[PDB]
Design a protein around this ligand. Structure first.
Ligand SMILES: CC(C)CCC[C@@H](C)CCC[C@@H](C)CCC[C@@H](C)CCOC[C@@H](CO[C@H]1O[C@H](CO)[C@@H](O)[C@H](O)[C@H]1O)OCC[C@H](C)CCC[C@H](C)CCC[C@H](C)CCCC(C)C
Ligand SMILES: CC(C)CCC[C@@H](C)CCC[C@@H](C)CCC[C@@H](C)CCOC[C@@H](CO[C@H]1O[C@H](CO)[C@@H](O)[C@H](O)[C@H]1O)OCC[C@H](C)CCC[C@H](C)CCC[C@H](C)CCCC(C)C
Ligand SMILES: CC(C)CCC[C@@H](C)CCC[C@@H](C)CCC[C@@H](C)CCOC[C@@H](CO[C@H]1O[C@H](CO)[C@@H](O)[C@H](O)[C@H]1O)OCC[C@H](C)CCC[C@H](C)CCC[C@H](C)CCCC(C)C
Ligand SMILES: CC(/C=C/C=C(C)/C=C/C=C(C)/C=C/[C@H](CCC(C)(C)O)C(C)(C)O)=C\C=C\C=C(C)\C=C\C=C(C)\C=C\C=C(C)\C=C\[C@H](CCC(C)(C)O)C(C)(C)O
Ligand SMILES: CC(/C=C/C=C(C)/C=C/C=C(C)/C=C/[C@H](CCC(C)(C)O)C(C)(C)O)=C\C=C\C=C(C)\C=C\C=C(C)\C=C\C=C(C)\C=C\[C@H](CCC(C)(C)O)C(C)(C)O
Ligand SMILES: CC(/C=C/C=C(C)/C=C/C=C(C)/C=C/[C@H](CCC(C)(C)O)C(C)(C)O)=C\C=C\C=C(C)\C=C\C=C(C)\C=C\C=C(C)\C=C\[C@H](CCC(C)(C)O)C(C)(C)O
Ligand SMILES: *C/C=C(C)/C=C/C=C(C)/C=C/C1=C(C)CCCC1(C)C
Ligand SMILES: *C/C=C(C)/C=C/C=C(C)/C=C/C1=C(C)CCCC1(C)C
Ligand SMILES: *C/C=C(C)/C=C/C=C(C)/C=C/C1=C(C)CCCC1(C)C
Lengths: 238, 238, 238
């Protein structure tokens, strides 16, 4: 199970990267069009932040597509993995932004936002180090390290942010829940796919893995953005 | 047409990098001296931001000077280009700062500033990826990708920022215009020099190109800063 | 003089990196526990910022421990140095955060904070370039370059921040002084160890150097944090 080798370079997964690229682009320009006439300062903020997400992902996918965003990591055993490191560059900026959308919806103080971005960033960076490690001891230690950070992220999301958002209007609290839940389930799928993909146990192929990440990314990007930018929760408050 | 090989390493363009370095340094310490006694909070802000620009550029130029900020990228055809990647590292921080000076002058909200910095950053990063690409398809696709971002940058500069600045005093609006125009013409010269230089069609030599970028940088840095830090527009308002 | 080669990879300094790692971790989770029940918004801010410091250092040390955070730089003379570049990645984020703790304590405006972070960052980056340089001319020129930035950092710390903090309560002013002094002496030890270690004259071994940096880091991290998070100065004001 793989796909189609779009660049004649022996990488069938490029078919999924290509589709991923296309999807992130139309998602970016759909959001720009849809929010082009928005004058509401609170709403343009959600639009601004949310447009940048698929925008940067577009760049990351195009880079993985061309092959520029992928590198060959030789394991201690001599086994060579193709690590699409560009994903981490993507996530370093996108996850904090998505987190920022949730923070705004909850109306939590700046310290809560700083904490989330800080821990989230630590999660992605450690995830990248583990991805480029040569030893299994190191590779899985980093996975566990990043996972812990992810735990704190989910924790403050389901407590601090949740309680704050529960004090807001029914419209706002409604949308918050139907994004945090989306995040909780979608985001958790990344560490899993990672440990079962070529970066870990390797029961999943690079072709299927890429397809999976592409479905995860588009949903967590465009899907999340669609639900958010569509809600009345981004328009001031009642 | 080239210059002088200052480090005996076979790089005559170092003569232009060296001059570029020297110029960015005296520019940084001239601004520090000139603004050393400024107590006005609004003015120190312009000084602070504006001093950091030639300061970081200094580091970038010195790095390109020594050869540390340059790498050999082998094209698919086997053609080897000398990519001074350090420029992009420079721009990632300097362009947003310059943009920040214009944002402050216009007195636009934080969302407008975030948008500009976000898109600008996407412009520089994609520009760097294109610079390090091995395929012509990839190299020019990234150029076009970065150009689009540049378009949005110029667009919001000439509309959102312009309209805001037009509501301010004649002194402030005056200086804004004579910086935005400077930016519009100078900044546009970068994508051009890029597509005609060694990173593209290659009708321009690496020696001339370096000289050009050095003249562009010093003007967009020191020149911009001189006009700004000299105006009364940075001192509160009438 | 060295230590113990914990990973059987011929690096006895890993014994110091390992201890450094362990210490940064218990420091991170001690601070989290100690501040877990803090409701004071001003205090959680100090806790938040201060927890992130040993947290990121933990990641950096673990990376140097595994060997992922170290690279072999070949000097022009053919001499090969083992540069633990991860330290710089660590510092790029930690120093600004520590600086941020001092800024908050002083209650200085955002421009002062931006300036400190900007110059500090320039210090670390140039320090890294010098660390990876191949020529002695370049390596020491960067050291001097970074040192100048450090000078400005210390300067504004002992003037702008000091004078501001001197206007606050005796409790706050007291803690500020017993952190700025700690910083002034500890921080100055880095450029020294650098110029006398393998990155410079090399009178100090890589084993001793690593031990030294580990003692410096833990004190500037956990020690600084202990004194700060223990004081009443982080709780509003009298
Ligand atoms: C987050 C910050 C550090 C900067 C944003 C990250 C961007 C720069 C994303 C670019 C990533 C880049 C590395 C792409 C991968 C390219 C790939 C082809 C190269 C992979 O190798 C990377 C290794 C270098 O070693 C290798 O080369 C040498 C020389 O040829 C070989 O001898 C060696 O065997 C090879 O492996 O380096 C990986 C990076 C280290 C592990 C650095 C540790 C990172 C530290 C811990 C990050 C601290 C950031 C912290 C999480 C920020 C949180 C701040 C909050 C408190 C707000
Ligand atoms: C902006 C952020 C990502 C971090 C700031 C960038 C700094 C880290 C600047 C350092 C740049 C660094 C890469 C200098 C160039 C050094 C040069 C000698 C190496 C060039 O190779 C870089 C390649 C690695 O591949 C190569 O090595 C392997 C292994 O030896 C070979 O097999 C391969 O053939 C070689 O080509 O990697 C280039 C980086 C990728 C293309 C990553 C994609 C970047 C993503 C799309 C960035 C998203 C950032 C976004 C624009 C932020 C906007 C945020 C707003 C919403 C606020
Ligand atoms: C601060 C910003 C730029 C981004 C945060 C830095 C992160 C990306 C930390 C990652 C550092 C990374 C480079 C780890 C070292 C890995 C090590 C194994 C590779 C070392 O080589 C790095 C060289 C690449 O050249 C080498 O490879 C080529 C190709 O194989 C060889 O031909 C060559 O001989 C080798 O040496 O590149 C080093 C980076 C340049 C010196 C870039 C200059 C940096 C500019 C001046 C930074 C400006 C940032 C400024 C201080 C920000 C201040 C902003 C304030 C105004 C707010
Ligand atoms: C860094 C980290 C966690 C960081 C957490 C952070 C930053 C949290 C921040 C929280 C904040 C800011 C909260 C704010 C709140 C405020 C509220 C608010 C304002 C926000 O609303 C409040 C109320 C105050 O809380 C975890 C690392 C976690 C790291 C881990 C788990 C590491 C594991 C390592 C292993 C397992 C090594 C193993 C090594 C071995 C087995 C070595 C073996 C050697 C031999 C190896 C060989 C040779 C076999 O290969 C040996 C045997 C020793 O020689
Ligand atoms: C153009 C582009 C990409 C182009 C790609 C190309 C051409 C690819 C070609 C591929 C080929 C030919 C492949 C061939 C294969 C064979 C190959 C071979 C084998 C032969 O080699 C084969 C045949 C298929 O098999 C990307 C742009 C990408 C563009 C992007 C990412 C733009 C982002 C914009 C943002 C992020 C705006 C943001 C706007 C905001 C935040 C606006 C805010 C405003 C709010 C106002 C305020 C607050 C700021 O004042 C608002 C009013 C809401 O707009
Ligand atoms: C020192 C330095 C560079 C040194 C370079 C050297 C020595 C080079 C030597 C080269 C040689 C010998 C070459 C030989 C060649 C042959 C070589 C061979 C072949 C032999 O190998 C040959 C012979 C020519 O051919 C750089 C410093 C560089 C220094 C920098 C970049 C400083 C930056 C400062 C900032 C950015 C301040 C900022 C201040 C602010 C923002 C202040 C704000 C205050 C506002 C107050 C507030 C708000 C913060 O509270 C204010 C009051 C305005 O100051
Ligand atoms: C648009 C991209 C999104 C929403 C990405 C989310 C990514 C994560 C929640 C990634 C988590 C990871 C771990 C918990 C362990 C190690 C590796 C990661 C980076 C895959
Ligand atoms: C001090 C440096 C300044 C003001 C640099 C400005 C740079 C630009 C406006 C660069 C634009 C580019 C494109 C539009 C396409 C691809 C490459 C770039 C990065 C050269
Ligand atoms: C937790 C880490 C801390 C507090 C690190 C502080 C580091 C410095 C003050 C480093 C200064 C350096 C110079 C002045 C010159 C060149 C190299 C450096 C980066 C070691």
């Amino acid at each position: 199970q793989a796909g189609f080798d779009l660049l004649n370079d022996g990488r069938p997964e490029t078919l999924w990267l290509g589709i991923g690229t296309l999807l992130m682009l139309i998602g970016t320009f759909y959001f720009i069009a849809r929010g082009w006439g928005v004058t509401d300062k609170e709403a343009r903020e959600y639009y601004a932040i949310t447009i940048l997400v698929p925008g940067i992902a577009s760049a990351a996918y195009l880079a993985m597509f061309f092959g520029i965003g992928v590198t060959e990591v030789e394991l201690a055993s001599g086994t060579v993995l193709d690590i699409y490191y560009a994903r981490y560059a993507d996530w370093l900026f996108t996850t904090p932004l998505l987190l920022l959308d949730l923070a705004l919806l909850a109306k939590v103080d700046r310290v809560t936002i700083g904490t989330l971005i800080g821990v989230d960033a630590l999660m992605i960076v450690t995830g990248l180090i583990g991805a480029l490690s040569k030893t299994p001891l190191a590779r899985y230690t980093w996975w566990l390290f990043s996972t812990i950070a992810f735990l704190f992220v989910l924790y403050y999301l389901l407590t601090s942010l949740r309680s704050a958002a529960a004090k807001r209007s029914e419209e706002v609290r409604s949308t918050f829940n139907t994004l945090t839940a989306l995040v909780a389930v979608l985001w958790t799928a990344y560490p899993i796919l990672w440990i079962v993909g070529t970066e870990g146990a390797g029961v999943v192929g690079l072709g299927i893995e890429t397809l999976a990440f592409m479905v995860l990314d588009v949903t967590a990007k465009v899907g999340f953005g669609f639900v958010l930018l569509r809600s009345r929760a981004i328009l001031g408050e009642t």
